[PDB]
Amino acid sequence: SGFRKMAFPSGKVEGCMVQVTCGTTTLNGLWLDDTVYCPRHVICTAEDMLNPNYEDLLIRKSNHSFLVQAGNVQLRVIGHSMQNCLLRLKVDTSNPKTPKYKFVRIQPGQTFSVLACYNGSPSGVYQCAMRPNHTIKGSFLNGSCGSVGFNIDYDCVSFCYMHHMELPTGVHAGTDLEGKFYGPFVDIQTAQAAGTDTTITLNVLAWLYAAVINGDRWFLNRFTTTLNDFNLVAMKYNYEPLTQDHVDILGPLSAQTGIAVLDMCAALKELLQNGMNGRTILGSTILEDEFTPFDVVRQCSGVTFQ
């Protein structure tokens, strides 16, 4: 019992973290097999990053330019290409740690685990969600670039994020491990803003189900809604419309509580229109959206305590 945002255990990813230096700039890299990936902006000076031409800047650098450290040990760089925003550095040694893995591009509303690093040295692990505006509300300082986000299924790590930058709001942006940004964001030090964000409805519902399972039933009503009419309402309040797939993903929490998905939708519609005063849910005034249907199912499982 008990509800906690959890991170996947970070050990398999820790064995791939390395340090990468080009000039006076150091940041982290991900060493899989005989390749190290890092953000390409590592090759930029303060003047370059304003308006960089990365093919131009890359053609200047040589394998030497890059110092790659795995602990104390030095790693000869024997090659360099560039994929989108990322550098692919071939190195003289193949990482004996490297885990069964894959690169997956995460979807808005999904969660993952971030291993915050500094100077190739892991500092901590935290939970996260990809926002619908394609940023994350992470925790990162200068030096964090190249830190990665991931999920583990079985023994296989699905890498989904590499950190590149902080926006002026104080949120974070980066890429998938094929270097293609989440969002409109570019790797240039220039005013860029987070777009208007949306609440993740799927996760708010899962939370309402957690709340019911977690000893609470005050929000619930007998009012009837269609998916359509719920969705019109969700949007005027900046909630994600609920898709058909979302209805399905909530199926198990519906069976467990016997509150039909649409009825929980009618619950949430009442909360958006009327507010929730002076009432709390799971001890929170506001609605939580970064806890997933999956998280709620796992933690509750498996008996009906009642």
Add this chain to the structure above:
Amino acid sequence: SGFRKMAFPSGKVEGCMVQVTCGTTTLNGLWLDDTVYCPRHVICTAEDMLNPNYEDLLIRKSNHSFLVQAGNVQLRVIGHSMQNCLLRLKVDTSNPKTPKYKFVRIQPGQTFSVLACYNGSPSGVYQCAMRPNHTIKGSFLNGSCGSVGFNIDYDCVSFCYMHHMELPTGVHAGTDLEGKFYGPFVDIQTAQAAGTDTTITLNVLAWLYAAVINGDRWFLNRFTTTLNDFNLVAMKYNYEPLTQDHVDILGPLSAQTGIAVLDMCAALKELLQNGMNGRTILGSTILEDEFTPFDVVRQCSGVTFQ
């Protein structure tokens, strides 16, 4: 920027996690050197556990009774003994992933990372606090026994907790790695309650400092307080007495933000009295007491925004 619950990288601990079976019971063990530690209650049948004498239960058993596995591999047990709550099973192999480690008894108010496992397999890591009433608000399911709690400094893992049971209220109880329970609990399947909990005042103040460091200030005021008039308010809201030793500890954060400890108490005293007016601090609507000063310093920048 940002602020998050944030656990230590779990890798060093993941390489010590094993499975211990006695009869039809499976739980987790901690493998250091030649030694595996798990909860002693692994011996117990259903009848035994209501009113169990553990010295007798153990005297009947042999090294053969206990199956320990590390991954696929079997580890032969060649010794066994009871230290307090936990068994020490000696095995014919020395864990080559053994990290520099030590064993510490954690003090109410401090935090640690929990590496939740099932069948010797790590599934999640999250941060917890030892509550003043000596019970942790964790997230554990059946099978999670033997999962441990820990902090890391440099190389060294300080293990502070091993999980034994969930109380009726849904909170969790366990021991240290000497096997002495935290709190008044015993290892028998009977309902046990904890004492009345208290909010950790030192931690709330560190968390308020964290908010300010991240640029959030609405709750500050020009007021100040005496320490004593502040403590007079703590007691009303069931917060813990603040002491001068506790005040000293906030000295670094006070300097960084330029907000005197006694002024932050005024801020808090106002919050407790007037509430929040549907506002949030670091995205929470409730005053957060499971971040230590150390937790704040480690994760926040050493310079303030503005």
